[PDB]
């Protein structure tokens, strides 16, 4: 099975968590199977995804971008058109709905930049559930606007003063609050990381990306399968949501674009599968950037949503059995893609998705105009206009 | 066949004495791992039962804020599993040592390499907080026919059926942990219930900051593990020596 | 007809422009009739709105908001889910695609807040056409983010330095550019306010809102028609696009919410149909805020997208023949509607649409639980988060 | 046969070039009280007519100098009602051509505007934002009156469009343009025109006034004269040489 009984995708995954947390993830796996056996659960979620989030998102043939590159045809899975403007809402809405079926009343999560905190707070307000988002205090001071967004949606943001007051401390604060209030609180992991069954739950809720693209590509082009799939990779939620519905279609190649930061051979990157190796972190056996003694190294990227040292266990499995390729994409390469898609197609992409766009133009030249690819446009770039404008202005006066 | 740690701790229990196990972070010292011998002999001369020795890890999930800071202090010196092994091979002591490490540094070093390199040391136990019962097959096979006991951790709020599943065949001692910390009367009852179905000493790893806390937990278990109070004191240059004397001398 | 050959909806409308501009308007109407006769023009436009913009947008039954108010069932036509986050793109896309049919190569427009500038630049990029957005210099120095947005989309932002350097000067700068280059340039009017045939063209491109909503209401509820329609009015584009497909259904009431600013009886408001009388402005005979001597008064509103002194002539017709009611909504009521929808439904609305939410709350209580209404959620309110945050912090300090 | 048509046809028959200054009503230190002083100043120079503008808050066919004069006039409180009251005291032999955008005229009432100016020197009317397609808003009210509705014609439009706007026109024709390409358009218009044609471009020197006298029947000056009277600059000699120009 994938994952198997103990939560392994091949050699990777599991639930390497303390016994105090083992009770919560066991209960969560049991409640998850019961929701899969119930047809009324998936039906209510399908209708809400349709009427509230706006699914299904179109598969848009980027005609201008395709003609500009002169290579393979590029089809963009328009996840940027979701309510909230990114894919994260698929997982959070599915997990809040699961929390309602469990009889829970409180929703908690952590965030760094703020994306998962907004998606979680949105899904909680839809279901009239109390929401608490844990942030490191140093992140609260830097994200006053996202803090206002989450409070606008009715959520309470709890600043974590302990430790370094960053995302690493908010994760522990949220996990400790999850165990303490297990009888009425559900913790929503934001990506395809963490202990079993979180990678499986996040994958299935994000599989609406690939299942729609597969049927949309056929109804649109008349062909059977695209030749390649491309998605950016942080923890791996949007990539595995696009890949998994195609995993048994051997002719469809898969590419996950990693954040190479300043350069794969520099001190500031996030290329997990290019420079990392298997280790145990965040309750999962996975590839992770680490020193020779097993200490986790800091990840760097121009896009905050991709600076994670690890990667989902299912992606490490794909990388192991050579089912998917994982390519580094640099800070500057992602900036070109951000500006390119804006003026060529009129779509302002997120800095995360710009890594996929950037590699998309590379792969397009390689495959030639006789092939086709589906790129997951994970999010819109409004949250990144301020950062990009400063970066291009600072570099203008300096060069 | 029987592990040394089980017998040594039964002897403390037999003498009507509570088991007292200090918890220190290896490398949390002015001169890093070079201060480990000094700290151990300092605790040995106070007559403690065993010494829990921690391996610092960059992302702990089960330590309190005092121990988390001790891990950061230790990593600055460059403390690694490899260097601790080299230090432990030169440590002579009659006190049994219990390695505390999160699984990744052990996993990178190699569990078999770790066990075999520590064959003739004072290491008698092993605590891996993030290696649950469901993944014990990563370590348990390599501990067969050795003198290193895999210490199981038990959450008191769980069901007695789950707790007994974790205790089955355990050696050394049982590490009772509790979520967070009326409520305190239910802890003593859940803790005393684990003491019955258990066949080896049951040690409390909760908040022990005074002699009253120590004597409260000895009424329902076999001893305590003190970490944060000793780590904070040793680093801040605070008195702790007399607190350990009274703790060791406690007559059940 | 409606409008007749002279461009009049009852008593309002017309082509009150100088003779230098009449040729551009007469060419526009001629070519527009050609696009209505060619079936491929709609087939192509229908697919792009589907693939690129994201249509059809769902009609969302706001369950929480309906039970919170306790009255009529509230259905939200989710124009906030459109690409670019507003309804304007419907009109910019149709008019640029109309300009593509006319053999034009350059697209121009003016904007004050920047929303129509962004929408026009987005549509021009889609069809690979040159775009210049005329913007008053006082607006350019205050909207640095939207100016960078328009430049990201490949558009040139022409800072109008002549005159008082406001939206009034940008209209002149844009219209002079249109006539001087009429052989290659087309001018995009932002709302349903202007000389014939612009109000008719804007209404028809925006009729996808009410056309989709009529069928979506029947598919979702099994009932025949809603009891009322609510929409905010600036120039009138999003409201007439919701109203017009229902115009022949007498049982459907229509409500357009005007910006009342600090108060209708004060000097800072924008309630055109409440405190205005018929005048001639922007090349059309309409109701407009004016003094006794014909000078056009300045309009004020918390939402800059609604501070227009006049209103589209078809709304003046709707208002005159009692087809639609026009009700004013103060800034304070809209500011509460902004926070109400964000917390109750997890949807952050535009400050413009917050006027519609504010009135829909009142109307839902009055109609009762046995009735239903469709509210046009014209746009999302990410663009308004910064403003609302500062306003809420300023109101708490003073009081 | 109205007065403005015959007055200007005589200037063309006498070999002289038609000269129509364009002032803005109320643009003075005393406001509308200085209008009599301004009209009588230009009368001693022998101008053919006088274009008087009504300031509007949203002008569409005015240059930056004229728009700057309209705002200067709005401060003193100049309104259509206030100008009609002043024109009842204006006595002059020069015909006056009132320029106004349609909304100040629409609010005051078209019929009220005509009836209240019957005994005045108002002989022509220019409404830039009132196209030929909406002449019914004004033309029916100008029958049996001495006020001519001045048509504006864009030289770059088709000749059939131009002949459509000139049919039955009185007073004069106003030629507008969106440099040698215009001379062909303006001469073709003078060919099919029965009344005089006038050019309302930005003539700044004597050479510009003469360049269009070979093809049109006269020029209209505004910016140069409005800016000179505001800044206190010499303009009085420039207007003399323009009137005395022989063709």
Residue numbers in the entry:
A (entry chain D), C (entry chain B): 4 to 402
B (entry chain C): 1 to 181, 188 to 258
D (entry chain A): 2 to 179, 190 to 258
What does the paper say about this structure?
In chains A and C, corresponding to TrpA (amino-acid residues 1–258), residues 1, 180–189 and 182–187, respectively, were not modeled owing to a lack of interpretable electron density. The structures of the FtTrpAB and SpTrpAB αββα heterotetramers provide a new set of high-quality models and enable comparison of the intermolecular tunnel connecting the TrpA and TrpB catalytic pockets. For example, one side of the SpTrpB tunnel contains βTyr311, βHis285 and the neighboring βLeu284, with the tyrosine rotated towards the active site of TrpB, where it could potentially interfere with the β reaction. In the SpTrpAB βeO state there is also a hydrogen bond between the αSer58 carbonyl group and βLys171, but βArg179 is too distant to interact with the catalytic aspartate. The activation of SpTrpAB by the α-binders is unexpected and surprising. The weak inhibition of SpTrpAB, which carries the smallest side chain among the tested enzymes (αVal61 in place of αGly66 in MtTrpAB, αLeu59 in FtTrpAB and αMet58 in LpPhTrpAB), supports the previous conclusion that any substitution in the loop would drastically reduce the size of the BRD4592 binding pocket, limiting the inhibitor affinity.
Tryptophan synthase (TrpAB) is a pyridoxal 5′-phosphate (PLP)-dependent enzyme that participates in the final two steps of tryptophan synthesis in plants, fungi and bacteria. The enzyme consists of two protein chains, α (TrpA) and β (TrpB), that operate as a linear αββα heterotetrameric complex containing two functional TrpAB units. In bacteria, TrpA and TrpB are encoded by usually adjacent trpA and trpB genes that belong to the highly regulated tryptophan-biosynthesis operon.
